[PDB]
Amino acid sequence: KDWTGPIGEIRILKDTTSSIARYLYRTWYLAAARMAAQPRTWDPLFQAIMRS
Amino acid sequence: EIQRHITEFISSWQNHPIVQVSADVENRKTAQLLHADTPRLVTWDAGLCTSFKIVPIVPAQVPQDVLAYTFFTSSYAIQSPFPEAAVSRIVVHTRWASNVDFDRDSSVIMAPPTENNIHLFKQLLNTETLSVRGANPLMFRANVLHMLLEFVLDNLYLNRHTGFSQDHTPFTEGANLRSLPGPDAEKWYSIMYPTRMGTPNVSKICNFVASCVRNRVGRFDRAQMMNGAMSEWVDVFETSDALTVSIRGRWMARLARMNINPTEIEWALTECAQGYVTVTSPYAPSVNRLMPYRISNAERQISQIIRVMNIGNNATVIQPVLQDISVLLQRISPLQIDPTIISNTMSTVSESTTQTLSPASSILGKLRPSNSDFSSFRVALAGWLYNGVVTTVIDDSSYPKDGGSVTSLENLWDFFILALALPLTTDPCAPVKAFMTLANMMVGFETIPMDNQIYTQSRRASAFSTPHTWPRCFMNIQLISPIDAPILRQWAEIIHRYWPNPSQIRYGTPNVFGSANLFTPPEVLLLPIDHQPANVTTPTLDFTNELTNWRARVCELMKNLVDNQRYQPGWTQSLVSSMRGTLGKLKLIKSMTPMYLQQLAPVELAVIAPMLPFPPFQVPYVRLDRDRVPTMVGVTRQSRDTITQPALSLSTTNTTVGVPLALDARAITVALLSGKYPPDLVTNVWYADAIYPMYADTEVFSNLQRDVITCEAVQTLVTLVAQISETQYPVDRYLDWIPSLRASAATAATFAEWVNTSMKTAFDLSDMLLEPLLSGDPRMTQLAIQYQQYNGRTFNVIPEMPGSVIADCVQLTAEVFNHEYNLFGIARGDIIIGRVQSTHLWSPLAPPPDLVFDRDTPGVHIFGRDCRISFGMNGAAPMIRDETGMMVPFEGNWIFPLALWQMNTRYFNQQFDAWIKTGELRIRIEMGAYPYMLHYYDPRQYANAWNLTSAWLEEITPTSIPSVPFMVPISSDHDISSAPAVQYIISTEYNDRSLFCTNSSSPQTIAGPDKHIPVERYNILTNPDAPPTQIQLPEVVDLYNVVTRYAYETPPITAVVMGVP
Amino acid sequence: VLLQRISPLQIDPTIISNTMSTVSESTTQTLSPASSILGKLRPSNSDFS
Amino acid sequence: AYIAVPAVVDSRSSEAIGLLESFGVDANDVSYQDHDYVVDQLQYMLDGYEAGDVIDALVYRNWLHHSVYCLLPPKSQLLEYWKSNPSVIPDNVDRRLRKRLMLKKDLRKDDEYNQLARAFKISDVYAPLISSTTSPMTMIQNLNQGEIVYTTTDRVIGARVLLYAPRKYYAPHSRFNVGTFPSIATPKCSVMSGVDIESIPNEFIKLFYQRVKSIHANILNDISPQIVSDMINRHVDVYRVDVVNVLFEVVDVADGLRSVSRKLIMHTVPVCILELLGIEIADYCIRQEDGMFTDWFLLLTMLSDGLTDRRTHCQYLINPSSMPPDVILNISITGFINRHTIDVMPDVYDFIKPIGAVLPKGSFKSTIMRVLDSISVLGVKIMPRAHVVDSDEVGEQMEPTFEHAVMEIYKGIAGVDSLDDLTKWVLNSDLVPHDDRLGQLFQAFLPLAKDLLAPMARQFYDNSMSEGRLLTFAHADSELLNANYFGHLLRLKIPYITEVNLMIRKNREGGELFQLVLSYLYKMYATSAQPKWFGSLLRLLICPWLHMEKLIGEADPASTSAEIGWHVPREQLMGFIPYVSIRAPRLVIEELMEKNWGQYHAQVIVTDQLVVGEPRRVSAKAVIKGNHLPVKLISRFACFTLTSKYEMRTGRGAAYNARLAFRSD
């Protein structure tokens, strides 16, 4: 019950779950949302560096 | 109950929730705000505008004895406009003869009334109804409202001009008949023109057709504007449906109000560009196109309010918007980086190698350039468009980490960085942070009086966020003593005098684009800094503006600090001279950035700001005035207890909106100190080259189309919910004779979910309409916005709700439904169950007035709350008790409500049915509205209704009732022998408007109910003195009128407005 | 248990979840007020004994 | 005239496919454009720029103004090529610069050349010029003017790119034209409306059309395939099957009157099955005298990947029982609304290896193992029963078996004895489980599922990999993962209610509600991965074989067939087991005689007696050592069976380093 249907190959976890996995979910979610807003991940030179 | 638990399991499986918005939606709000799709407004219909089809029920007796087979037109295969059957009725079916571009995914499709139409009235709220037949009678009003909403939304099309052909038969006077496309089109003409048919017989069709006016067929009006072109509009006589004609006329009126022609598109794209690019529009007679884009002002403001309510205290929806405008400024800005200019100018600072400190080399470590420094500058430049929802502050890590003595040189540079970076941010507490940055660094050196023991002098400067943490010694400069804190006395006057001054720049095109701003007038933007339009187009370095003056006076404060007499003898002379030279050079660094912010950035902000997916939202800037700092910009979406006026219920029922976001102070002042131009820049070439690809899109013209639907569905929601709940808006209710329940907030929320799902199923939408209003209490809704200053004075905006089209058309359809409830499969009144045995041929949808009775009939017992039955003892009759306290036997004329039977449907059946069947009592069951079947029967044979009426009485449930069965005789055209028939359920009111004609291909109807072709519908044919336009629409629908047919084309904007590269 | 099974009211969890939105992150350092109240409220369907 | 279709169109190949009758248009004057290169060009275009600029640039391009690019070496090799053997210098050049180029042995010492070359720009000579900083909008807007455009970079979108220099310096219309990108620059350009944006299989055409219909939806001249068929008139690949959807409705004719209950839809049935079953727009009774579904509606529902209704849009799982809350008994088919192709060969099927299909506990197995056993399209068998392993069989070779092993889990719960009391304790009257009690049962179920079943399953699946390549059913997802199963993992579901199947079937050997409880245990034991619609396997199983006989049919059985298998040398003391079997036309098996079948080695253990009345056979065991067989090693044009047992044509046998051998006629 504590999943929805797929977004492609990913099911999302609804936040009204009763299990402990929402606390695992919110840390990785906040982590991704705060690393994507950094300015350093968007110049092409750093993407070439992380390719290397 | 082993088998019964399977039924319980399936019935608990099928009640799944239709709405699963339990997951988060703020990853989808961002994509919707950055790019919302357009609805689909104009769709073309090449068929004929009708929704009522005449269906046959019982076929005619095409061989018989009393009349030869050579009489009928059916023997000669003559096509007729009407079904040549024994009984014909009118049913409802939207979009037959409709070769549309695509469907709205709406349909009111009805079976003929001899079948079961119960599935249309258990669609909405019957989660807990067990049987396949049967629906809850307390849901009938909501079911009918959703059916009328579908019936309106399925007719939103525009009529298309197909093509004509003059006939060669002598059937008309050389008239011009329409030809409609399709795979099989040679049989539409008999349907589409009733008066074209020849007249051989004295059949009823041929009696109708030959009694009409001949010159009202085909084309009678056109508009021929050019040689060899499509006619723009015609007026044609054909079979139609005046309700559908009215709906499409109102829809055409709305889209004709939205129309623009490319001359003001040229003018608007010139004014939005401010002359830096010009476009053209031709000068020739038009081909009469339709480009719906001009909308009103309130429709724009309401969608702006809904978007501000969407971005609620989140700072992850609005962050990609500022990041987008950063890239968009970077694309067309002429300024670039030059990171090497500080490293070049700090190579000639005179200092000694023997010293340990190095003022020339400390700034280069404190202020390192990294070429990613405009990414944090253009976001601060783009945050000027939004102070209401976004308050850009300086990051926490850009402060000197618990104070920092002024004796330290690194903290002295850290003061300079913040003193240059703070005027760029739109935070209102920027001057008090600039003051307390120095006052933290001077603790024990120079002291000033504070307000409390909490916000002391050593209290950290980033903790001043609320506009009355401002110290009293800041706004009274006289409180700072000139002889015990002279440098703070200096810096206070520098802040109070040389802080920048707000201005205004005038973007926007008010004609085509509806202006979106609120609390500011239209066609104006507010800037925190001052601007002057440049006179030259070959720019060059100057030193007279507010930012360069600010840098110079911060440098001169640091010169007075190093020349203080308490501070100098702690240093050596070769260090003091080097620091003074570094400051004297850093004042006179040569950077273009203060000139750019003065002259060119306010022009290109106004160039960009109309062409933007989220329009500007500003409250007034203010320097240094405590009483005018805005707090709590707040939107409302509902009223409260009983206060029905938005200006009164606004102050206590709002939601405060807005975020702070953090930027670093190093990267802004690197941009301010290091920025240069191209080598030979000429601005009227540079901006004309840059702006030209930007103004070939049409995305803002799609957003203007979406705001129509976003304002329209709200008024549709209010009008439809007000028919079942008790709202505050003055609406017109028509469907009170249909029963429903006392709706709660959950019922209203569910019905509103069905409303907006049906709303976005049509118009082809896929994201997020009307859910921000839907999330709480859709009964009492209102839309307003307000903020206040520090002194408690409140501005507010309550936008008016403009004209709505769908909400008008639903009420029009309800006004028709009040008089034509029969065609949609609904009866009115209530039924009377009683044994009637005769050989007569009257119909139970029109009973004789001898059999009915009411509350005013003398000798009729009325039953209410009290249903207490005493049994019979030793042969006496069983008794039931009256409303008035009497006690009557099972005999006579009774009146029930339906709910009294439903609550006791088992206990009443055993007591009553054996008396209803053979005895002498008749029960009137008050219902108000009910659907119905029609079982016909041959009137020459016996017919008992008990197997139908017992199956109706035994399926009545506290939840649901099934449809009511009737028995109507089949009419004939020759004399028949009569047989006795027994029927039990009759109606009360007249109930026979659905019948069209009986014995359509026959000379007369003798036995049974007859009805000729309804003359009152086909008014234009049968009345030679009526005008062709006339419809008597609230009473009947007339099935035939003139309809106009357009042939306008819808070209894109770039196919008519070129742009001259 | 009897008073729970008689009652018309069901305690749904979705009303707070359709409003408060655990995402929020007003600031960038620590949790927002909106995401901090939900860590206490915990709108789970355990029970309401 | 220019219309646009939702598929990749090349001029030479999509005419051989036809590609327009495939959407449903009866059809010279229809000239196909080559939009093959623009899709790869778009894929190279998207990684640098954003999406919206690229798409909104490509939208405004007509496909009748014929034009071309030009790509030149940047500056140094540009001046060096003019220095070289051709003096093909244009007349836009500087009068001094061409004079310094017409001399001999220029070098760094020439100040008079270098001073002018360091101030020379390419934009002085060539105009209009695409540099790397130009927007994608202005590339196409400048391209629509003058039939040739000079560039600097490769990353452009639109027409074909041709080069200016040799590589040593670098680092035809008709009346009706179709394409795959809707143009806007002409007032008349058209887009077809057959299929929606949810069934477009290219994932770049889908991304394009969503963005086009998102903003330009009002101004698109929209037409239907019937209107296209009006406007026109007045080797053979397998694994490409046309699909449609069935728009039906359930009707309840009790006696006399009929009613309409639901309005369903069935998304991706293949067209060949609808043609060979011979069904039309009429009414149908879908029950037998028993109440079982009458063997063709069952196959239709097992071919599809969905079944929903049209008033709401939730998933509708039909009732397989005959208990009437909702019995579906009569079907009225009302049309077929969209039509497109689909590549039946999936993504996960790469190497030839056994197939693990995960079905739930109460899914219809006893019917499909009867139906799939009784199909034969050619002189082969598609899926016999002897190649199918039940989910039951893996836990039966044990001291009392896994169902009976967890049947006696009740000893260990307080207040629980006499298993009916446990089943009464877990399930309520609704037969929906309580939230805690099912997990309290599961925390004792789980070590019996892992520490007891999984080693035996690992041993059994190693044994099943040894004795041929088979198809193994499985209850749960993790049952094939905790035991290290080797093969393709397929997560499947059927459109039916699997729960009420568990109350119909008697002879269940235990509690009739206990097996529903045991089904819930397996449903919670599996991982949270989305299953993939059993029709996704059944179309692969049936539809290539049925399409094959329409063109392989009656050529010759000797030289249409061939078989792959392991080959042992004749020098043995007392051989060709088959591996797959391939049926193809003559040219395809002639193309299969090459592509040598070495670099594939096994170790065949071959010792058994003769078992059945067929000729001399020994059930061998082959264990593949090297890499397994790719499918593009076989073909895209030749069908092949998926499962096979091992046998060869007395004595003994030992470990033989076998190799493959393609035999044919």
PDB file of C-alpha atoms in Angstrom, chain D residues 56-130:
ATOM      1  CA  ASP D  56      11.240  24.861 -30.327  1.00  0.00           C
ATOM      2  CA  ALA D  57      13.886  25.548 -32.961  1.00  0.00           C
ATOM      3  CA  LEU D  58      13.213  22.314 -34.869  1.00  0.00           C
ATOM      4  CA  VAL D  59       9.435  22.929 -34.797  1.00  0.00           C
ATOM      5  CA  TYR D  60       9.604  26.029 -37.031  1.00  0.00           C
ATOM      6  CA  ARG D  61      11.238  24.270 -40.009  1.00  0.00           C
ATOM      7  CA  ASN D  62       9.555  23.394 -43.286  1.00  0.00           C
ATOM      8  CA  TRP D  63      10.619  20.221 -45.038  1.00  0.00           C
ATOM      9  CA  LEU D  64      10.188  21.460 -48.603  1.00  0.00           C
ATOM     10  CA  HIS D  65      12.712  24.321 -48.722  1.00  0.00           C
ATOM     11  CA  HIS D  66      15.602  22.034 -49.630  1.00  0.00           C
ATOM     12  CA  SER D  67      18.992  23.066 -48.226  1.00  0.00           C
ATOM     13  CA  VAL D  68      22.305  21.881 -46.790  1.00  0.00           C
ATOM     14  CA  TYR D  69      25.086  22.869 -44.355  1.00  0.00           C
ATOM     15  CA  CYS D  70      28.785  23.565 -44.814  1.00  0.00           C
ATOM     16  CA  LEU D  71      31.471  22.804 -42.223  1.00  0.00           C
ATOM     17  CA  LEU D  72      34.949  24.298 -42.388  1.00  0.00           C
ATOM     18  CA  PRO D  73      38.224  23.949 -40.450  1.00  0.00           C
ATOM     19  CA  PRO D  74      38.391  26.673 -37.791  1.00  0.00           C
ATOM     20  CA  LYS D  75      41.046  29.293 -38.585  1.00  0.00           C
ATOM     21  CA  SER D  76      44.571  27.937 -38.883  1.00  0.00           C
ATOM     22  CA  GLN D  77      43.768  25.010 -41.142  1.00  0.00           C
ATOM     23  CA  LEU D  78      41.389  27.344 -42.996  1.00  0.00           C
ATOM     24  CA  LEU D  79      44.259  29.650 -43.939  1.00  0.00           C
ATOM     25  CA  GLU D  80      46.509  26.609 -44.462  1.00  0.00           C
ATOM     26  CA  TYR D  81      44.097  25.098 -46.990  1.00  0.00           C
ATOM     27  CA  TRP D  82      44.126  28.344 -48.968  1.00  0.00           C
ATOM     28  CA  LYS D  83      47.927  28.230 -48.729  1.00  0.00           C
ATOM     29  CA  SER D  84      47.839  24.706 -50.190  1.00  0.00           C
ATOM     30  CA  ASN D  85      47.407  23.352 -53.735  1.00  0.00           C
ATOM     31  CA  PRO D  86      43.940  24.808 -54.568  1.00  0.00           C
ATOM     32  CA  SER D  87      43.740  28.550 -55.047  1.00  0.00           C
ATOM     33  CA  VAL D  88      39.975  28.388 -54.567  1.00  0.00           C
ATOM     34  CA  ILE D  89      39.997  31.522 -52.381  1.00  0.00           C
ATOM     35  CA  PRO D  90      36.660  33.390 -52.620  1.00  0.00           C
ATOM     36  CA  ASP D  91      36.293  36.971 -53.787  1.00  0.00           C
ATOM     37  CA  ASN D  92      35.283  38.182 -50.309  1.00  0.00           C
ATOM     38  CA  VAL D  93      38.926  37.914 -49.240  1.00  0.00           C
ATOM     39  CA  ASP D  94      41.224  40.797 -48.379  1.00  0.00           C
ATOM     40  CA  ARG D  95      43.250  42.112 -51.313  1.00  0.00           C
ATOM     41  CA  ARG D  96      46.444  42.012 -49.244  1.00  0.00           C
ATOM     42  CA  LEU D  97      45.699  38.635 -47.664  1.00  0.00           C
ATOM     43  CA  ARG D  98      45.226  36.811 -50.966  1.00  0.00           C
ATOM     44  CA  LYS D  99      48.412  38.490 -52.223  1.00  0.00           C
ATOM     45  CA  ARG D 100      50.328  37.129 -49.246  1.00  0.00           C
ATOM     46  CA  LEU D 101      48.730  33.725 -49.852  1.00  0.00           C
ATOM     47  CA  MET D 102      49.732  33.525 -53.529  1.00  0.00           C
ATOM     48  CA  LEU D 103      53.435  33.573 -52.588  1.00  0.00           C
ATOM     49  CA  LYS D 104      55.664  30.627 -51.689  1.00  0.00           C
ATOM     50  CA  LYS D 105      57.256  29.500 -48.392  1.00  0.00           C
ATOM     51  CA  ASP D 106      55.413  31.642 -45.880  1.00  0.00           C
ATOM     52  CA  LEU D 107      56.497  31.217 -42.274  1.00  0.00           C
ATOM     53  CA  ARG D 108      56.462  32.797 -38.811  1.00  0.00           C
ATOM     54  CA  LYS D 109      59.104  35.360 -39.852  1.00  0.00           C
ATOM     55  CA  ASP D 110      56.618  37.070 -42.205  1.00  0.00           C
ATOM     56  CA  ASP D 111      55.319  39.930 -40.079  1.00  0.00           C
ATOM     57  CA  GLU D 112      53.239  41.275 -42.972  1.00  0.00           C
ATOM     58  CA  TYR D 113      51.187  38.074 -43.196  1.00  0.00           C
ATOM     59  CA  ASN D 114      50.869  37.373 -39.478  1.00  0.00           C
ATOM     60  CA  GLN D 115      49.762  40.917 -38.593  1.00  0.00           C
ATOM     61  CA  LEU D 116      46.806  40.624 -40.979  1.00  0.00           C
ATOM     62  CA  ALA D 117      46.061  36.992 -40.117  1.00  0.00           C
ATOM     63  CA  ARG D 118      45.721  37.797 -36.406  1.00  0.00           C
ATOM     64  CA  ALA D 119      43.018  40.375 -37.235  1.00  0.00           C
ATOM     65  CA  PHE D 120      41.230  38.213 -39.830  1.00  0.00           C
ATOM     66  CA  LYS D 121      37.832  36.726 -39.006  1.00  0.00           C
ATOM     67  CA  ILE D 122      35.848  34.000 -40.749  1.00  0.00           C
ATOM     68  CA  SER D 123      32.702  36.103 -40.332  1.00  0.00           C
ATOM     69  CA  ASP D 124      34.205  38.733 -42.638  1.00  0.00           C
ATOM     70  CA  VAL D 125      34.209  36.351 -45.608  1.00  0.00           C
ATOM     71  CA  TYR D 126      31.330  33.958 -44.898  1.00  0.00           C
ATOM     72  CA  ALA D 127      27.865  35.221 -43.989  1.00  0.00           C
ATOM     73  CA  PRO D 128      25.593  33.939 -42.525  1.00  0.00           C
ATOM     74  CA  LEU D 129      27.841  31.887 -40.240  1.00  0.00           C
ATOM     75  CA  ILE D 130      26.851  29.524 -37.437  1.00  0.00           C
TER      76      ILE D 130
END
